[PDB]
């Protein structure tokens, strides 16, 4: 890119428990815990009851060291800069006898001038990590009260004192592994003249005819002389220059601010998943001094507008996203860290997770505030997949300190990550925290703390979430939306508040409300709602024994962290399904349950646009093997919920909704084009495959762009008897003028437990080659909610958790790199009727 040389300090690292004098090889970026595991100095933290057996680690201090060589030629470069993209958390960094840095915030990258401290030959780097617990014990003792952070799984709630990933201290789906280490890369850059400290491509305006941009560079010049330079910006698309601009300057020692306007005529816009291509331009800034390009930085840039509209209206206060001027109904999920040990998350795992969102027709992900500001790769993948990103700051569920030192650390991370992320097309909004305002209003505090301490907490809220964070966003990301808290007003126990802003409706699960309540309890935007399930058996076998297999054994409860657990799964299951006697069948039906109940809500929210303008379910993914609200387990396996979210988020959806012994059929489209001259066709089919009555035809339908509309209503009485309702289903297709199918749905008229399901044999043929299995499935009679189960971790399915309709063949492709020709894939097909006698 330029004349600099970058040395990655990713080898030759060793670590030691402080005070032992024993050193072992370590992997950096990494964690103390992984380094221990890799020498069998911890048990598999995820296996069994082993969580208690790993806790001692957080009490020790840990040292890391490496050495490296610098040449006489490198040492004579104008500048040499050591960069820590991440240190978790309290780290004293020494290089060749110099204390370079006393680090104290996991979420901040540190850039350090080191030329004057480096030596020709061997150079020695030592990092001392103070235990974040022992570091903060004296701070807690001075505080005189315990912050109410119930997800911090320790008697003393020390999490609140440290700018360290909240979930690391435990959460209601997570293991406590309070880890330390060099968690993101370390980089030594040898360079001449200057580095580009920041490059911000600021969009000033965008219309169909012109995008106007301001390229804002901050250049740190490291030599004593004034240096003539030319700044150049090249804008390209797919390798071809679109526009190019330049500016002469003379760079002064220290910081220089440079602004170059650029325009792209007839811009090709970045569109979200579902509405087109997520086009990205390549913007490259260079600093040229004489012949040499001494510094260069590039960003991929998406040209689009995002506006969050949050305005008083007749229904209360709206909360929705307008993308490229068009209201966009949000479809997605809440994202949590993908591992207890962040650096174990590989490039491949990030890529697969985005394939999983894109394939489920999502257009939004919330990076929830108990995790981390995600790495650059996460955002690059969001940009290239058309997925909008809601980014919480990293504060969740408790009030936090607001003393001057604490607020300076926070300001440092807010500036760092805002500048880090603000060039991403995907980045859509910032949210000050998760549930802290709700917590302060509703969760009991005025009777847990003195009135003085409670008042302090309330003024402390404002200092951080209503002043410091919104001011920082206004300064560094001024055209992006900020809201101080999610949910900002609406509270799930208070119906009167549901028309105001975004909701976390935990009436389902925590309030024990039936899934049917999601049809009536409607929000303006659902930013959280959820339901737990045990993960499938091959994941259970990664973490439990057949002994170790009851819903409330020590081990199952050890793998449940919500305030209840596993009893609640059984309670809800009983409402809708016959509860199976075996543990394996109970796991299967609980997957089915979570998928069917949650998709009922996803459909209610889309059906009720424009009152409701988004749904993000809790939660996408898992950080370890566990029972949780996730749609995808720790090993990448889609639960039923993920297949059902795909179906519910389909661009065009036929949604039959039955209430009060009556059926309505809604046609729901997130297409940018209107469909004309459409025909809905339906027919009742019993479980043996025989049609009941005649086909019903609704012709001449239009499905306008971005709308949900009722096209058919019929009372059940006079049409089907209670007996038929238990013994048949409705098949629904939507087709264009010429008979081409654009959508299909199936409807059942009774709860699954009330269906008279025939005993049946799902048979299959298989064609297996390397990487691939093609199965053809057949059953003469209905097989309900079939699960095609294979022991192969992370195998992918074209479909799963679907009703196999009577006498109707169904092709399913299974893929995995570990599918070998001639070593046939174990396949177990389960279905509802098989689970009881």
Ligand X SMILES: OC[C@@H]1[C@@H](O)[C@H](O)[C@H](O)c2[nH]c(CNc3ccccc3)c[n+]21
Binding footprint of ligand X on the chain (CB under 6 A): 171-173, 370, 396-397, 434-435, 504, 506, 510, 528, 562-563, 618, 629
Of residues 658 and 816, the one with the C-beta less far from Br ion: 658
* Exposed e or buried b per residue across 492-517, where buried means at least 16 C-beta atoms within 10 angstroms of its C-beta: beeeebbbbbbbbbbbbbbeebebeb
**Which two structure tokens, joined as six digits, stand for 588?**
């299967």
Of residues 164 and 232, the one with the C-beta less far from ligand X: 164
Of residues 434 and 566, the one with the C-beta less far from ligand X: 434
Of residues 463 and 833, the one with the C-beta less far from Br ion: 463
Q: Give the one entry of Br ion, ligand X, none that residue 261 binds, where binding means its C-beta sits below a cut-off of 5 to 8 angstroms depending on kind.
A: none
CB of 365 to ligand X, least distance (A): 14
CB of 664 to Br ion, least distance (A): 11
Q: Give the one entry of Br ion, ligand X, none that residue 115 binds, where binding means its C-beta sits below a cut-off of 5 to 8 angstroms depending on kind.
A: Br ion
Of residues 381 and 616, the one with the C-beta less far from ligand X: 616
Residue 115 binds to Br ion (criterion: CB under 5 A):
yes
Of residues 34 and 398, the one with the C-beta less far from ligand X: 398
CB of 150 to ligand X, least distance (A): 7
Helices and strands in the chain, H and E counts: 16, 44
Beta bridge partners of residue 708, listed in sequence order: 668
Q: Give the one entry of Br ion, ligand X, none that residue 817 binds, where binding means its C-beta sits below a cut-off of 5 to 8 angstroms depending on kind.
A: none
**Which two structure tokens, joined as six digits, stand for 646?**
């795909």
- Whole-number Å distance between alpha carbons of 588 and 799: 16
**CA neighbours within 13 Å on the CB side: how many for 30?**
20
Residue 121 binds to Br ion (criterion: CB under 5 A):
no
Residue 484 binds to Br ion (criterion: CB under 5 A):
yes
CB of 257 to Br ion, least distance (A): 4
Q: Give the one entry of ligand X, Br ion, none that residue 51 binds, where binding means its C-beta sits below a cut-off of 5 to 8 angstroms depending on kind.
A: none
Residue 590 DSSP one-character state: H
Residue 77 binds to Br ion (criterion: CB under 5 A):
no
Residue 480 binds to Br ion (criterion: CB under 5 A):
no
On whether the CB atoms of residues 295 and 196 are closer than 8 A, the answer is yes
Residue 79 binds to Br ion (criterion: CB under 5 A):
yes
Q: Give the one entry of Br ion, ligand X, none that residue 113 binds, where binding means its C-beta sits below a cut-off of 5 to 8 angstroms depending on kind.
A: Br ion
Residue nearest to ligand X (CB): 506
Is the peptide bond prior to 97 cis by the omega test (within 30 degrees of 0)? no
* 459, 596, 733, 792 from 538: Cα distances, Å: 49, 22, 36, 8
Residue 470 binds to Br ion (criterion: CB under 5 A):
yes
**Which two structure tokens, joined as six digits, stand for 820?**
């070998």
- Whole-number Å distance between alpha carbons of 425 and 383: 6
Give the pairing type, strands 783-789 and 802-804: antiparallel
Of residues 157 and 299, the one with the C-beta less far from ligand X: 157
CB of 316 to Br ion, least distance (A): 19
| 229-288 binders of Br ion (CB under 5 A) | 256-257
Site string for Br ion, 449-468 (x = CB under 5 A): -----------------x--
Residue 795 DSSP one-character state: -
Residue 300 binds to Br ion (criterion: CB under 5 A):
no
On whether the CB atoms of residues 370 and 164 are closer than 8 A, the answer is no
Q: Give the one entry of Br ion, ligand X, none that residue 405 binds, where binding means its C-beta sits below a cut-off of 5 to 8 angstroms depending on kind.
A: none
CB of 619 to ligand X, least distance (A): 7
Backbone phi, psi, residue 578, to 5°: -75, 125
Of residues 232 and 504, the one with the C-beta less far from ligand X: 504
CB of 527 to ligand X, least distance (A): 9
* 106, 146, 415, 460, 684 from 405: Cα distances, Å: 16, 19, 16, 13, 68
DSSP-derived 3-state class of residue 10: coil
Of residues 73 and 554, the one with the C-beta less far from Br ion: 73
CB of 80 to Br ion, least distance (A): 5
Beta bridge partners of residue 312, listed in sequence order: 317
CB of 537 to ligand X, least distance (A): 24
What value does the CA radius of gyration of the chain take, rounded to a whole number of Å? 29
Of residues 661 and 770, the one with the C-beta less far from Br ion: 661
* 378, 442, 475, 789 from 638: Cα distances, Å: 20, 35, 41, 11
Helices within 268-375 (DSSP H only): 347-359
- Whole-number Å distance between alpha carbons of 805 and 685: 9
CB of 29 to ligand X, least distance (A): 26
CB of 662 to Br ion, least distance (A): 7
Burial label, 201 (beta-carbon count in 10 A; 0-12, 13-18, 19+): buried
Residue 113 binds to Br ion (criterion: CB under 5 A):
yes
Q: Between the CA atoms of 714, 717, 722 and 724, what dihedral angle is there, to the nearest 10 degrees?
A: -50
Instruction: State which H helix or E strand residue 461 sits in.
Output: helix 451-461
Of residues 358 and 504, the one with the C-beta less far from ligand X: 504
- Whole-number Å distance between alpha carbons of 719 and 697: 15
On whether the CB atoms of residues 368 and 430 are closer than 8 A, the answer is no
Q: Give the one entry of ligand X, Br ion, none that residue 562 binds, where binding means its C-beta sits below a cut-off of 5 to 8 angstroms depending on kind.
A: ligand X
| 649-668 binders of Br ion (CB under 5 A) | 658, 661
CB of 511 to ligand X, least distance (A): 10
Q: Give the one entry of Br ion, ligand X, none that residue 79 binds, where binding means its C-beta sits below a cut-off of 5 to 8 angstroms depending on kind.
A: Br ion
Of residues 256 and 491, the one with the C-beta less far from Br ion: 256
Of residues 257 and 314, the one with the C-beta less far from Br ion: 257
Q: Give the one entry of Br ion, ligand X, none that residue 435 binds, where binding means its C-beta sits below a cut-off of 5 to 8 angstroms depending on kind.
A: ligand X
DSSP 704-718: -TTEEEEEEEEESTT
CB of 78 to Br ion, least distance (A): 8
On whether the CB atoms of residues 568 and 509 are closer than 8 A, the answer is yes
On whether the CB atoms of residues 107 and 84 are closer than 8 A, the answer is no
Q: Which residues bind Br ion (CB under 5 A)?
A: 79, 81, 113, 115, 256-257, 466, 470, 484, 658, 661
């Amino acid at each position: 890119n330029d004349t600099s040389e970058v040395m990655l300090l990713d080898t030759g690292w060793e670590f030691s428990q402080s005070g032992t004098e024993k050193w072992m090889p370590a992997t950096v970026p990494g964690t103390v815990h992984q380094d221990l595991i890799s020498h069998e100095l911890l048990p598999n933290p995820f296996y069994g009851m082993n969580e208690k057996k790993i806790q001692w680690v957080e009490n020790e201090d840990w040292e890391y060291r490496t050495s490296f060589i610098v040449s006489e030629e490198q040492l004579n470069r104008d500048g040499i800069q050591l960069i820590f993209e991440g240190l978790d958390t309290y780290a004293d960094v020494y290089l060749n006898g110099s204390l370079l840095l006393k680090a104290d915030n996991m979420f901040v990258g540190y850039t350090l001038p080191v030329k004057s401290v480096l030596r020709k030959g061997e150079n020695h780097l030592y990092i001392y990590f103070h235990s974040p617990i022992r570091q903060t014990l004296p701070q807690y003792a001075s505080n005189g009260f315990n912050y109410p952070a119930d997800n911090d799984h320790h008697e003393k709630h020390l999490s609140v004192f440290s700018r360290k990933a909240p979930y690391s201290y435990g959460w209601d789906w997570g293991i406590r592994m309070v880890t330390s280490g060099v968690w993101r890369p370390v980089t030594l850059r040898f360079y001449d003249i200057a580095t580009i400290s920041d490059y911000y491509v600021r969009q000033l305006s965008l219309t169909d005819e012109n995008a106007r941009l301001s390229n804002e560079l901050i250049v740190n010049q490291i030599v004593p002389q004034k240096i003539p330079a030319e700044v150049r910006v090249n804008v390209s698309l797919n390798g071809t220059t679109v526009t190019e601009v330049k500016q002469q300057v003379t760079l002064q020692p220290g910081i220089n601010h440079i602004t170059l306007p650029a325009e792209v005529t007839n811009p090709v816009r970045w569109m979200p998943n579902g509405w087109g291509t997520p086009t990205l331009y390549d913007f490259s800034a260079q600093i040229a001094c004489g012949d040499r390009i001494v510094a260069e930085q590039s960003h991929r840039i998406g040209l689009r507008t995002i506006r969050v509209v949050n305005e008083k209206d007749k229904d209360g206060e709206s909360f929705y996203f307008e993308v490229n001027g068009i209201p966009m109904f949000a479809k997605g999920a809440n994202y949590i860290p993908q591992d207890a040990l962040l650096p174990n998350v590989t490039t491949e795992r990030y890529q697969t997770l985005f394939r999983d969102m894109k394939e489920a027709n999502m257009n939004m992900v919330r990076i929830w505030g108990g995790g981390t500001y995600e790495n650059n790769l996460f955002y690059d993948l969001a940009d290239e997949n058309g997925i909008l990103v809601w980014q919480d700051f990293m504060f969740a569920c408790t009030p936090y300190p607001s003393d001057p030192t604490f607020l300076k650390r926070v300001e440092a991370e807010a500036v760092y990550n805002i500048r880090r992320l603000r060039n991403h097309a995907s980045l859509a909004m910032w949210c000050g925290n998760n549930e802290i305002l709700e917590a302060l209003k509703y969760w009991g505090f005025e009777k847990k703390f003195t009135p003085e301490v409670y008042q302090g907490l309330m003024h402390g809220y404002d200092k951080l979430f209503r002043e410091l964070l919104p001011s920082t966003v206004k300064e560094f990301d001024s055209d992006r939306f900020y809201v101080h808290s999610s949910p900002y007003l609406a509270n799930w126990g208070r119906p009167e508040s549901w028309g105001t802003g975004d909701s976390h409706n935990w009436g389902v699960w925590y309030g024990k409300k039936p899934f049917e309540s999601l049809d009536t309890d409607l929000p303006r935007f659902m930013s959280e709602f959820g339901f737990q399930s045990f993960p499938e058996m091959k994941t259970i076998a990664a973490f439990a024994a057949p002994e170790d297999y009851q819903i409330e054994s020590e081990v199952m409860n050890a793998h449940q962290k919500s305030s209840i657990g596993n009893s609640l799964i059984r309670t809800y299951m009983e409402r809708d399904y016959i509860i199976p006697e075996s543990f394996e069948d109970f796991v299967y039906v609980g997957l089915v349950l979570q998928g069917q109940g949650m998709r009922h809500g996803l459909e209610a929210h889309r059906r009720n646009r424009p009152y409701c303008m988004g749904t993000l379910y809790w939660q996408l993914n898992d950080s370890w093997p566990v029972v949780s609200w996730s749609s995808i387990d720790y090993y990448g396996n889609w639960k039923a919920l993920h297949y059902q979210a795909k179906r519910a988020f389909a661009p065009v959806l036929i949604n039959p909704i039955q209430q009060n012994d009556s059926l309505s059929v809604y046609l729901i489209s997130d297409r940018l084009d209107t469909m004309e001259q459409m025909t809905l066709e339906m027919k009742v089919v019993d479980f043996d495959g025989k049609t009941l009555g005649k086909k019903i035809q609704v012709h001449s339908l239009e499905v306008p762009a971005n709308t949900s509309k009722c096209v058919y209503r019929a009372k059940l009485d006079g049409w089907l008897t209670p007996e038929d309702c238990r013994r048949s289903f409705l098949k629904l297709i939507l087709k264009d003028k010429s008979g081409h199918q654009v959508a299909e749905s199936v409807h059942f008229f009774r709860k699954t437990k009330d269906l008279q399901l025939p005993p049946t044999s799902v048979s299959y043929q298989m064609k297996q080659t390397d990487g691939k299995c093609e199965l053809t499935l057949f059953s003469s009679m209905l097989a309900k909610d079939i699960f095609i189960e294979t022991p192969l971790q992370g195998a992918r399915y074209s479909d799963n958790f679907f009703d196999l309709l009577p006498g109707e063949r169904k092709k399913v492709i299974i893929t995995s790199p570990r599918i070998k020709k001639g070593e046939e894939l174990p396949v177990n097909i389960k279905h509802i009727r098989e689970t009881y006698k």
